[PDB]
């Protein structure tokens, strides 16, 4: 029973002690909702902690870290207890054990601890987990081990507020540059998702990704055979193009747009939404980058999703037509109109997402403000396609930001 296990774990006889921690591990690895609460209150934690120090007994160290790993895999209150029992420095000491079964289970325990919070992340980092962890990446390492290493490397990147230190980011990227060429499916997915979080932190870390030189190996993953790899890559590269125009160009300089005809027509709508969301930020840059969306024959595919796509895809598509409207030249907006952008763009005012309504009308505002002579020409298109009637009825007080816009547009051109 429980009380006997917590007692037999203190024996001086290794035989009874080991066979007692083996029982403490199974009770934590016998289902998916283990009795972890009753295990913490059972006082087993300090005995499991001290077992980590028995360099003379490796099999005791393995079973001890396994038990502590699964307790850390629970809630934050469950994970705090493992770190509150002074087990983190002993795990780090085990990273250099001459028994690979002990090195691996110590890595596994640290990842769950790192994943709980940025405080617990910076704690294990300050002690120096990155340098020995990345020392495991080698030819002779098994694949099941490397998968655990890459996953801890994800949590080392996972949180952005506060973001991980630069010293650690500068140490991880030269390993991602090595792990991005792996053949295993799960390793590559984790190697790209870590890039997604590093590109999600901020522009200061996006340049670290750029300066590392890994983007030329990240863009071709937009056409990888596995959808799991593109989804992370589409998110990873999708964040890079959210900073400065000089950083977005590095993405386009890797022929990023030549991978999107297979994404704008993908059957999965999540990819479609994630694809147009990328092109939206591209339409926010300078005119040369806006022209790159035009020189790739992507605008008709954006408009098609703007017409027949889903709500989440149309929201990012209306954004894509908007950022281009207030940034590009007159012929680029004129190119939009001759591509029959007028009918579907106005058919999104009836949505209850005020953000989209503001987006289209502002884009509807900047269109009419750019074609100075073709005001009557374009106005007939909006009136014939049924937009003006929807423009007229948008003068309601349920949002002054919309009311003010839908009136000035009418007062100047209608």
């Amino acid at each position: 029973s429980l009380e006997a296990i917590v007692q037999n774990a203190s024996s001086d006889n290794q035989g009874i002690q080991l066979s007692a921690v083996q029982a403490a591990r199974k009770l934590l690895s016998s289902d998916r909702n283990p009795p972890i609460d009753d295990l913490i209150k059972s006082g087993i934690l300090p005995i499991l902690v001290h077992c980590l120090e028995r360099d003379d007994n490796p099999s005791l160290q393995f079973e001890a870290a396994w038990a502590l790993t699964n307790i850390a895999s629970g809630t934050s209150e469950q994970t705090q207890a493992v770190v509150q029992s002074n087990a983190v420095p002993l795990f780090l000491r085990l990273l250099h054990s001459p028994h690979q079964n002990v090195c691996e289970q110590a890595v596994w325990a640290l990842g769950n601890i790192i994943g709980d919070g940025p405080q617990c992340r910076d704690y294990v980092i300050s002690l120096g987990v990155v340098k020995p962890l990345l020392s495991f990446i080698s030819p002779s390492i098994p694949i099941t081990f490397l998968r655990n290493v890459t996953w801890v490397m994800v949590n080392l990147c996972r949180h952005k507020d506060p973001p991980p230190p630069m010293e650690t980011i500068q140490e991880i990227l030269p390993a991602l540059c090595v792990l991005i060429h792996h053949t295993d499916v799960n390793i590559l997915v984790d190697t790209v998702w870590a890039l997604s979080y590093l590109t999600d932190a901020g522009n200061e870390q996006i340049q670290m990704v750029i300066d590392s030189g890994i983007v030329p190996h990240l863009v071709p993953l937009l056409s990888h055979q596995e959808v799991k790899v593109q989804t992370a890559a589409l998110r990873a590269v999708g964040n890079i193009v959210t900073g400065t125009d000089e950083q977005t160009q590095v993405v386009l300089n890797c022929d990023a747009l030549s991978h999107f005809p297979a994404l704008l027509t993908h059957p999965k709508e999540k990819i479609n939404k994630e694809a147009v969301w990328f092109l939206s930020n591209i339409t926010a840059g300078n005119q040369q980058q806006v022209q790159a969306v035009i020189d790739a024959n992507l605008v008709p595919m954006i408009i098609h999703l703007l017409d027949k796509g889903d709500f989440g895809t149309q929201k990012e598509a209306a954004w894509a037509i908007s950022n281009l409207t207030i940034s590009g030249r007159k012929d680029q907006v004129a190119y939009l109109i001759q591509q029959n952008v007028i009918p579907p763009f106005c058919n999104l005012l009836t949505v209850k997402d005020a953000q989209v309504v503001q987006v289209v009308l502002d884009g509807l505002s900047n269109i009419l403000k750019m074609a100075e002579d073709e005001a009557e020409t374009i106005g007939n298109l909006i009136e014939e396609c049924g937009g003006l009637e929807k423009i007229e009825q948008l003068q309601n007080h349920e949002n002054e930001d919309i009311y003010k816009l839908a009136y000035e547009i009418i007062d100047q051109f209608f």
């Binding site: 895999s73 769950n112 709980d116 997915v189 989804t231």
Partner: peptide, 14 residues
Amino acid sequence: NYCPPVKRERTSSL
């Protein structure tokens, strides 16, 4: 949709 997990258990068989 397959975001990598935050925490992980190691299941036994045995």
